[PDB]
Design an enzyme around this catalytic site. Structure first.
Site, PDB file in Angstrom:
ATOM      1  N   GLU A 102       0.877  -1.158  -0.014  1.00  0.00           N
ATOM      2  CA  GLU A 102      -0.026   0.080  -0.059  1.00  0.00           C
ATOM      3  C   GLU A 102       0.764   1.094  -0.059  1.00  0.00           C
ATOM      4  O   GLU A 102       0.541   2.406  -0.545  1.00  0.00           O
ATOM      5  CB  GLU A 102      -0.733  -0.100   1.301  1.00  0.00           C
ATOM      6  CG  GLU A 102      -1.911  -1.093   1.230  1.00  0.00           C
ATOM      7  CD  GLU A 102      -1.373  -2.228   1.898  1.00  0.00           C
ATOM      8  OE1 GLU A 102      -2.272  -3.336   2.317  1.00  0.00           O
ATOM      9  OE2 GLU A 102      -0.273  -2.444   1.858  1.00  0.00           O
ATOM     10  N   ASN A 152      -4.473 -16.477   1.240  1.00  0.00           N
ATOM     11  CA  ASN A 152      -5.521 -16.103   2.423  1.00  0.00           C
ATOM     12  C   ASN A 152      -6.582 -15.245   1.850  1.00  0.00           C
ATOM     13  O   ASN A 152      -7.786 -15.374   2.247  1.00  0.00           O
ATOM     14  CB  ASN A 152      -4.959 -15.452   3.530  1.00  0.00           C
ATOM     15  CG  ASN A 152      -5.899 -15.347   4.675  1.00  0.00           C
ATOM     16  OD1 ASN A 152      -6.733 -16.459   4.857  1.00  0.00           O
ATOM     17  ND2 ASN A 152      -5.910 -14.226   5.399  1.00  0.00           N
TER      18      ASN A 152
HETATM   19  C1  LIG Z   1      -0.022  -4.281   5.428  1.00  0.00           C
HETATM   20  C2  LIG Z   1      -0.985  -5.333   4.952  1.00  0.00           C
HETATM   21  N1  LIG Z   1      -1.659  -5.463   3.866  1.00  0.00           N
HETATM   22  C3  LIG Z   1      -2.495  -6.247   3.580  1.00  0.00           C
HETATM   23  C4  LIG Z   1      -3.138  -7.165   4.626  1.00  0.00           C
HETATM   24  C5  LIG Z   1      -4.031  -8.232   4.077  1.00  0.00           C
HETATM   25  N2  LIG Z   1      -3.756  -9.600   3.886  1.00  0.00           N
HETATM   26  C6  LIG Z   1      -3.683 -10.499   5.025  1.00  0.00           C
HETATM   27  C7  LIG Z   1      -4.494 -10.636   6.130  1.00  0.00           C
HETATM   28  C8  LIG Z   1      -4.233 -12.074   7.018  1.00  0.00           C
HETATM   29  O1  LIG Z   1      -4.224  -9.529   7.136  1.00  0.00           O
HETATM   30  C9  LIG Z   1      -6.034 -10.427   5.662  1.00  0.00           C
HETATM   31  O2  LIG Z   1      -6.524 -11.557   5.030  1.00  0.00           O
HETATM   32  O3  LIG Z   1      -6.736  -9.301   6.100  1.00  0.00           O
HETATM   33  S1  LIG Z   1      -3.053 -12.188   4.165  1.00  0.00           S
HETATM   34  C10 LIG Z   1      -2.338 -11.489   2.905  1.00  0.00           C
HETATM   35  C11 LIG Z   1      -1.744 -11.923   1.670  1.00  0.00           C
HETATM   36  C12 LIG Z   1      -1.040 -13.457   2.129  1.00  0.00           C
HETATM   37  O4  LIG Z   1      -0.163 -13.597   0.936  1.00  0.00           O
HETATM   38  P1  LIG Z   1       1.113 -14.696   1.278  1.00  0.00           P
HETATM   39  O5  LIG Z   1       1.593 -15.433   0.023  1.00  0.00           O
HETATM   40  O6  LIG Z   1       2.049 -13.994   1.862  1.00  0.00           O
HETATM   41  O7  LIG Z   1       0.578 -16.035   2.306  1.00  0.00           O
HETATM   42  P2  LIG Z   1      -0.379 -16.772   1.925  1.00  0.00           P
HETATM   43  O8  LIG Z   1      -1.616 -16.699   2.574  1.00  0.00           O
HETATM   44  O9  LIG Z   1       0.106 -18.252   2.367  1.00  0.00           O
HETATM   45  O10 LIG Z   1      -0.280 -17.207   0.375  1.00  0.00           O
HETATM   46  C13 LIG Z   1      -2.750 -10.158   2.688  1.00  0.00           C
HETATM   47  C14 LIG Z   1      -2.590  -8.878   1.614  1.00  0.00           C
HETATM   48  C15 LIG Z   1      -2.238  -7.009   5.691  1.00  0.00           C
HETATM   49  N3  LIG Z   1      -2.656  -8.035   7.043  1.00  0.00           N
HETATM   50  N4  LIG Z   1      -1.419  -6.210   6.030  1.00  0.00           N
END
Ligand SMILES: Cc1ncc(C[n+]2c([C@@](C)(O)C(=O)O)sc(CCOP(=O)(O)OP(=O)(O)O)c2C)c(N)n1
Ligand SMILES: Cc1ncc(C[n+]2csc(CCOP(=O)(O)OP(=O)(O)O)c2C)c(N)n1
Ligand code: SF4
Ligand code: SF4
Ligand code: SF4
Ligand SMILES: [Mg+2]
Ligand SMILES: [Mg+2]
Lengths: 1164, 501, 167
Positions: free
Chosen positions: A61, A999
């Site tokens: 972001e 996720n």
């Molecule tokens: C700074 C920031 N940006 C975006 C997110 C959202 N966010 C997540 C959570 C758990 O917080 C959510 O689903 O709300 S999980 C996620 C992506 C996870 O991708 P990864 O490839 O690293 O892990 P996997 O889920 O095993 O595929 C994002 C972008 C976040 N948590 N923090």
């Protein structure tokens, strides 16, 4: 026109029309906004400029915000969508965008910030964290207001030059489906200030009329220059007000900076913001009609706060005001909205008693009964200030007492609850039912969906409302006219019939007859059915789907059963609308699939039978509860009520003040969600333990036992003689945990015996037998065995320290982490990035990480999504400091009068404190001598020994493991990972590469390959996959390895052990098959084998220690692929859905050959 | 002992003694703290734990913030130094550190945020941007207060489990050289709650007694879990108050959560924070002697804001209050301190006219002549609200008019200005003169240095003061007893003899 | 580079004899690569609005010399030399072409003249020090390079943080 949308789609509708560029990054619950903007652009939807919106995904972001800033300064109208932790990272750029007076709209699905714990759910904590950036802030209270106020924001920002944050409550509005009036793009273009747009273009950076912006300023001019923007903020309230009149004339719906609703002579008024305003107005209507002089002020434009527009709508009769804030600022005098109201009223000498409270944090329920509690507090002799509503605060006594329950729902509104199973079609059908009713009747329609933390087999609860009046009930259903249970297992497990109205409808999906109702239904359920005189209907949807050939899909069947009894529309009309939607859904599937779903509707109508129950059911008495087993206090007081869907009743005194939870708590869940479980055939088993290796839930393990320990075994606990010189004289058995198995089928597929030693049998047939079998295997004593832990067979005899997590059935991530705990889990600390691994690894109140018999196990922590590498780096520094404090006390003990055996172990530890095996050996020696040495000492010498005993938990050397997904490692956390690897610290990074953001639903990443289709990449990713492993090799002193468990077990074992022993940074990039690929999870291991065999995923190991020995550090472990590259792509939906498609498949094959040929040159 | 230090060195002195790890990343004007802490470790200075501080430089302050969290959760007392854009990148981790109740002190040389322009100079915009993270916030107004309150923060955070931001005005205090009483490390160790340190070790991440922290929570328990820390914030004011008494008995200098200075029967009072409090008290002394009923409330503990400790020092004779905020929140109804003062007085039914203003953004000069203008606005028939001081706002008419120029410097204080050329040795010599005078006389000594944006050949203006009384003049020299011009080119170019007595 | 390049009130970047010269902007320390990336997207968007108005001019009753330069520009709008050549031809024929037009044709020509500052292809330059490229902004620099955008990144490697004293 009228459409059924959610807040996200309503916002994206307006944002798409008004913007040329949209730079995005996924974060729940804002990511649906960016997903639908990508799909519309993929199909060529035109904005008000006649072009398609350009959607650009960044690495974070922060990167997204900078792209917004550059796009704006160069002359393109740009928007973005974010929330929660994402909005925090945009705060630095928000000061710049506001400071430079750039028109812009950020659309925020307001979500809580990660404090003592993460919460993906809704409150204003994120929006409040940026209230000082200079952005304007506009709040939408309903899905209809999201549509309108998003238009208000985009129109006002062009006129005012002040950027806007348009925010709506996460989930409570962003995911609530409602029938609303959608504003046409052609009508939007008629309200745009085109002169304002052209002026914005002239201010763009352009070499033909250049300028300089963003200078650095000294104290002589900085203050004055900062105040020079004062007119623009002074003019914004009137500008927004005039824009609201433009929208008012078009839509008929009148918004103001602050809106009032309630008695004109009201004495008690609530000031609030967001979706709470809908709940409050519904209650105000109910109370005003009953004669109470109450009112409500809705805050629309929170910043800039216009005192004139606030006082304009405040009745002169107001004597007491309660302000409700959907956030918490610890230690602050009051929350933001409360301090503003208190300030403005003071600036104008109003003698009004003001009181502030907090509500709805993390999507905490906020219903009319709470609204009356806020109003009753204003009616008290001394209103309580700084209060909370919706919780029971028995520690600091801030909560308001909810005395009575009121029903403020408008008369004529139908209310339904649907209890479903994960991905059984219930939620999708209810969305279709809302769309059916909204499109063909004059009724308003509303839908809200409660999901489960468990990814497979979870409980879903749908809340639907239809009525002749607009639906302001932004809360869960209190009194339902109909309750439907689409899973009979819920009977006796959850309070299904809670709050159902007298004479209501109860629809059940089960195979039970009317007579079996007496024995199957619980007494409390039978009492409610009889006393409330409910219309009880039953249907065997599973039997119908089997006979037709739809398998076990009951979504079409249960939807037909609903309309047949709900009496919302004529039954004949509903059947037409259902079948018409079937043509739209199954038209492309073929004629065979189409007529099967047509028969599902027809057969469902005839099979729905009303259950005529005896009136004596009202007097039924509960059955005697069995003698409950002695469970830990946490399990009894916390985990059980939470899993029983009663967690909201737990008071504040239940929880720790810092979000610390015990370990090894998932073993108390015993969900029993498997359809089939592996049955072990002892005669076909070669005792290889590969089934225990690949199990994504640790539900199947090998057990050894001396023949004397098999005394009280059940008759079905058949064992076999143990193979191997290490296990001579012992018995062997492969035992499965039936209640913890998921039925994925990975263990049966990996079994390499000639005749399969594992066969999938239905759970219900062998559940009673295997439960007693597992209960005996789990109680077996520990067996000292000399199997080499470096092998696959020997490692599986060590206890798994990651068990029974919430990952999907057949997940490709948990087998990697489970294997690490079996090798080094005794002494490791985990810093886990936000993502899937943090959801199944750390969702309260259940912890999948557990301990061994000595009580030792991995310590687990998750900080943020972007900081995980630096998070684990800090742990390494602290652990090193803690060992240094211990080494000083041990060196001091050498000069103390202590036993000679004590000095021998101390010197041995001091020489080998940095070795895993030696530090454990001499460390345990010191532990054994500590109690006796302290007893033989006194005075200052005893104190020196007591300080060693205080630090004995740092004798054994620790193993820092930094675990996270590919989205973290390749994008948002790559800068930090690059720094931690370059530092040279002794850390081990494990990247679970799923090639998507798994996720959050499966969005595009730099780990996504060429041509792969994911969310935010509807037309396929053009650029190739970034090679993270190659960049980490460029340092030379970083151990890098690419592994894949499904491809080679032995290659995974070697890289993990080599990486952990390496005294330096190690990077393990593991291929993790996932449901987002669009594959059968039963053959998850097989898909990873095909990936390496087709040249899609490489297997290599870069050992810096080989360079010091004069050898080549790069070793290519799989040189010649044997499978076809194009055939592997067609086995996953993420590539077949693209079929321009053929050009991308050819580029992917050329990149795989160039990557393999480059590894051959580095290896030669 | 008495030494001549600046705010940065004074803070790093205490931070080094009380910390085991310091993860740092450079940003003006806080980087001198991390530079001098790095040099001390290289020469083997010992902390109160007998070891050298471990300094780790990250790729950004965000990486630094994450490293702090990991080091704290793993059981090492960790600090950091940052400011401005650096503090913003640490805001996400601050929610975690505060949310998990980890003892910690961030030392901040408060600096303006980049808005319409970048500014390396001092104001409270950075600290105010994190006021909702749950960290405590403690403000020191002078170099001596940096020494004392940094100790207060490190002692209080161990007892309260609430992390602290100890901040002081960038440049105006971080780079102001003053002769102060330096607190010995051995005396600090005599005040530490060692029981609190050992308890902090027991909560650390360790595989031999494992636990899970930082979980994800559903709506059923998140609200309750967030309110479960209420006792810790309610107890923080009293803990800070008692810690200040420990320092008081040791040093003789008495700090409170809110301090009052001025006439006991004052009717016009300024509420402020940071180095302005020195300037305001100096002006208050001048006005009170002239018979005006004026006073000053210094805000020390900004968060948690204790209404009880604020009303404790507010005279009952106060009729009008002017709140001064060293920040700007565009479009907001008022700035943060103004809204707190307005709220607490409303919660207690005080009939006090409150008026808020802005000052000193980006190290804008804030001198006693401006302070009188703030007091004069409170004496007007209709006091102007939402004002500015130190600028001429001819567009929106928010600025107060500087009617007359007053000299409130204590009598007997020597004042010198030195106009130098870039890197010609003038600044270094003036610093050495301060050390010479401070080490060998009973006089207080102060030095502040105006630098140029040009890296080579720039103009430097040094402002030095020596007097028998403590030097509260946190502003440029108004009337100089001596003016030195070390470059003849300035003759006829700059107003050298400006304001000479 | 931002202190000597953009410290108020003096700007060292200047214009040529025709009044054209580099436009200069500085955002933050960590976001500079993505900052210039956003500029590249916007200029591409601004060129599309001009190119669409030129394609409409082909179907309008205008002089043959005006249409000849438009076809030449549309074929070479993405080349530095060709776009400037035919762009200046459009600029020279615009005042006379506007004089000979009326109604919607005159408005269509006035829209070309309004956007003539996007005829010449632009050159986006992302300038920063080693501290930005190697540390705080590396994640963003890595991402913009992977995107494939037509940006020119100039890393002035001093091997230290020169502005903040040499860290
Ligand atoms: C700074 C920031 N940006 C975006 C997110 C959202 N966010 C997540 C959570 C758990 O917080 C959510 O689903 O709300 S999980 C996620 C992506 C996870 O991708 P990864 O490839 O690293 O892990 P996997 O889920 O095993 O595929 C994002 C972008 C976040 N948590 N923090
Ligand atoms: C987010 C942020 N962190 C820190 C700073 C302070 N700061 C300004 S320039 C600079 C370092 C510049 O180093 P480099 O990239 O090598 O450029 P150079 O000055 O050497 O040309 C720093 C740390 C800042 N302005 N913003
Ligand atoms: S079927 Fe799947 S979950 Fe069950 S034991 Fe086998 S691998 Fe584990
Ligand atoms: S995979 Fe098959 S042969 Fe190997 S241990 Fe398991 S059941 Fe036995
Ligand atoms: S990585 Fe894929 S399979 Fe594993 S839990 Fe996440 S979504 Fe499910
Ligand atoms: Mg992933
Ligand atoms: Mg440099």
């Amino acid at each position: 026109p009228k459409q059924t949308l959610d807040g996200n789609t309503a916002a994206a509708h307006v944002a798409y029309a008004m913007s040329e560029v949209a730079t995005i990054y996924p974060i729940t619950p804002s990511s649906p906004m960016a997903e639908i903007a990508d799909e519309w652009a993929a199909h060529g939807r035109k904005n008000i400029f006649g072009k398609t919106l350009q959607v650009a995904e960044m690495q974070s972001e922060a990167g997204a915000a900078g792209a917004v800033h550059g796009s704006l300064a160069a002359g393109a109208l740009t928007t973005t969508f974010t929330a929660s932790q994402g909005l925090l990272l945009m705060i630095p750029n928000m000061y710049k965008i506001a400071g430079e007076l750039l028109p812009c709209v950020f659309h925020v699905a307001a979500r809580a910030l990660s404090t003592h714990a993460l919460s993906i759910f809704g409150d204003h904590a994120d929006v409040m964290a940026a209230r000082q950036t200079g952005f304007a802030m506009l709040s939408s209270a309903s899905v209809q207001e999201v549509m309108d106020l998003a238009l208000v924001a985009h129109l006002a920002t062009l006129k005012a030059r002040v950027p806007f944050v348009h925010f709506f409550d996460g989930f409570r509005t962003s995911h609530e489906v409602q029938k609303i009036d959608v504003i046409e793009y052609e009508d939007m273009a008629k309200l745009v200030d085109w002169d304002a747009i052209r002026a914005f273009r002239q201010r763009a950076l352009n070499p033909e009329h250049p300028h300089q912006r963003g200078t650095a300023q000294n104290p002589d001019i900085y203050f004055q220059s900062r105040e020079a923007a004062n007119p623009y903020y002074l003019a914004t309230p009137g500008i927004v007000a005039q824009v609201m009149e433009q929208v008012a004339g078009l839509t008929g719906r009148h918004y103001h900076l602050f809106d009032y609703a309630g008695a004109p002579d009201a004495e008690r008024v609530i000031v609030s913001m967001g979706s709470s305003c809908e709940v409050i107005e519904e209650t105000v209507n109910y109370l005003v009609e009953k004669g109470e002089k109450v009112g409500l002020i809705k805050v629309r434009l929170f910043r800039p706060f216009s005192a004139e527009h606030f006082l304009k709508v405040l009745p002169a009769s107001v004597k007491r005001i309660a302000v409700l804030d959907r956030t918490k600022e610890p230690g602050s005098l009051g929350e933001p909205l409360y301090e503003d109201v208190q300030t403005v009223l003071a600036e104008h000498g109003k003698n009004i008693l003001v009181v502030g409270g907090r509500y709805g944090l993390g999507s905490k329920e906020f219903n009319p009964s709470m609204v009356k509690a806020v109003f009753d507090n204003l009616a008290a002799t001394t209103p309580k200030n700084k209060f909370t509503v919706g919780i029971t605060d028995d520690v600091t006594h801030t909560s308001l007492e909810i005395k009575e329950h009121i029903d403020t729902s408008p008369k004529g509104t139908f209310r339904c609850k649907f209890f479903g199973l994960g991905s059984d079609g219930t939620v999708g059908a209810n969305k279709n039912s809302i769309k059916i009713i909204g499109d063909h009747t004059d009724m308003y329609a509303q839908g809200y969906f409660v999901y489960d933390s468990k990814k497979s087999g979870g409980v879903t609860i749908s809340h639907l409302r239809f009525g002749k009046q607009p639906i302001q009930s932004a809360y869960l259903i209190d009194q339902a006219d109909l309750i439907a249970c689409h899973n009979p297992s819920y009977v006796g497990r959850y309070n299904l019939l809670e709050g159902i109205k007298p004479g209501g409808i109860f629809l059940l999906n089960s195979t039970w007859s009317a007579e079996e109702m007496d024995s199957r239904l619980p007494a409390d359920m039978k009492r409610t059915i009889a006393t409330k005189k409910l219309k009880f209907y039953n249907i065997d949807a599973v039997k119908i789907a089997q006979e037709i050939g739809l398998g076990s899909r009951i979504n079409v069947i249960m939807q037909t059963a609903f309309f047949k009894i709900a009496n919302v529309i004529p039954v004949d009309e509903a059947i037409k609308y259902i079948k018409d939607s079937i043509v739209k859904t199954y038209g492309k599937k073929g004629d065979k699939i189409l007529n099967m779903n047509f028969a599902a509707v027809d057969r469902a109508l005839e099979a729905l039978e009303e259950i005529k129950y005896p009136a004596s059911w009202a007097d039924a008495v509960d059955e005697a509860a069995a003698t409950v087993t002695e469970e830990p206090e946490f399990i009894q007081k916390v985990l059980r009520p939470i899993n029983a869907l009663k967690g909201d009743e737990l008071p504040v005194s239940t929880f720790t003040p810092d979000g610390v939870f015990p370990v090894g708590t998932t073993k108390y869940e015993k969900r029993g969600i498997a359809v089939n479980i592996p049955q072990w055939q002892p005669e076909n088993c070669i005792q290889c333990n590969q089934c225990s290796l690949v199990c994504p839930h640790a539900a199947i393990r090998p057990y050894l036992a001396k023949p004397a320990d098999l005394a009280g075994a059940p008759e079905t606990f058949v064992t076999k003689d143990a193979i191997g010189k290490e296990a001579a004289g012992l018995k062997f058995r492969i035992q499965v945990s039936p209640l913890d198995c998921t039925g994925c089928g990975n263990c049966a597929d990996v079994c390499p015996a000639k005749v399969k030693a594992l066969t999938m049998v239905p759970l219900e047939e062998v559940t009673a037998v295997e439960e007693a079998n597992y209960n005996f295997a789990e109680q077996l004593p520990e067996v000292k065995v000399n199997f080499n832990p470096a092998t696959v067979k020997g490692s599986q005899f060590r206890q798994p320290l990651l068990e029974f997590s919430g990952a999907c059935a057949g997940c490709g991530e948990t087998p990697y982490v489970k294997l690490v705990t079996q090798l080094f889990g005794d002494r490791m600390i985990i810093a886990n990035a936000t993502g899937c691994s943090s959801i199944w690894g750390g969702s309260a109140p259940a912890c999948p990480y557990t301990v061994n018999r000595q009580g030792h196990g991995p310590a687990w922590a998750s900080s943020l999504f972007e900081d995980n590498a630096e998070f684990g780096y800090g742990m390494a520094l602290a652990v090193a400091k803690r060992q240094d404090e211990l080494a000083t006390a041990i060196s001091k003990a050498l000069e103390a009068p202590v036993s000679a055996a004590f000095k021998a172990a101390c010197e041995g530890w001091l020489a080998g404190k940095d070795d895993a095996d030696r530090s454990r050996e001499y460390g345990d020696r010191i532990k054994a001598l500590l109690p006796g040495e302290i007893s033989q000492a006194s005075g200052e010498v005893k104190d020196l020994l007591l300080d060693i005993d205080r630090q004995k938990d740092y004798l054994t050397k620790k193993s820092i493991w930094i675990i996270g997904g590919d989205g973290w490692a390749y994008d948002i956390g790559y800068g930090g990972l690059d720094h931690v690897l370059a530092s040279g610290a002794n850390v081990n990074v494990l990247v679970l590469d799923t090639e998507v953001y798994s996720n959050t639903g499966g969005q595009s990443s730099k780990a996504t390959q060429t041509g792969a289709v994911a969310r935010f990449a509807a037309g396929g990713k053009f650029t190739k996959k970034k090679d993270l492993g190659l960049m980490a090799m460029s340092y030379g002193y970083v151990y890098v390895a690419s592994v894949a468990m499904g491809a080679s077990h032995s290659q995974l074992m070697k890289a993990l052990i080599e990486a952990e022993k390496y005294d330096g940074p190690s990077l393990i990039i593991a291929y993790a098959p996932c449901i987002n690929h669009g594959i059968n999870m039963t053959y998850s291991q097989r898909e990873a084998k095909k990936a390496v065999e087709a040249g899609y995923w490489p297997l290599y190991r870069y050992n810096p220690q080989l360079a010091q020995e004069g050898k080549n550090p790069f070793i290519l472990d799989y040189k010649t692929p044997t499978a076809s590259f194009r055939d592997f792509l067609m086995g996953e939906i993420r590539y077949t859905s693209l079929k321009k498609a053929e050009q991308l498949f050819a580029k992917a094959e050329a990149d795989a050959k160039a990557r393999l040929e480059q590894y051959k040159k580095l290896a030669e």
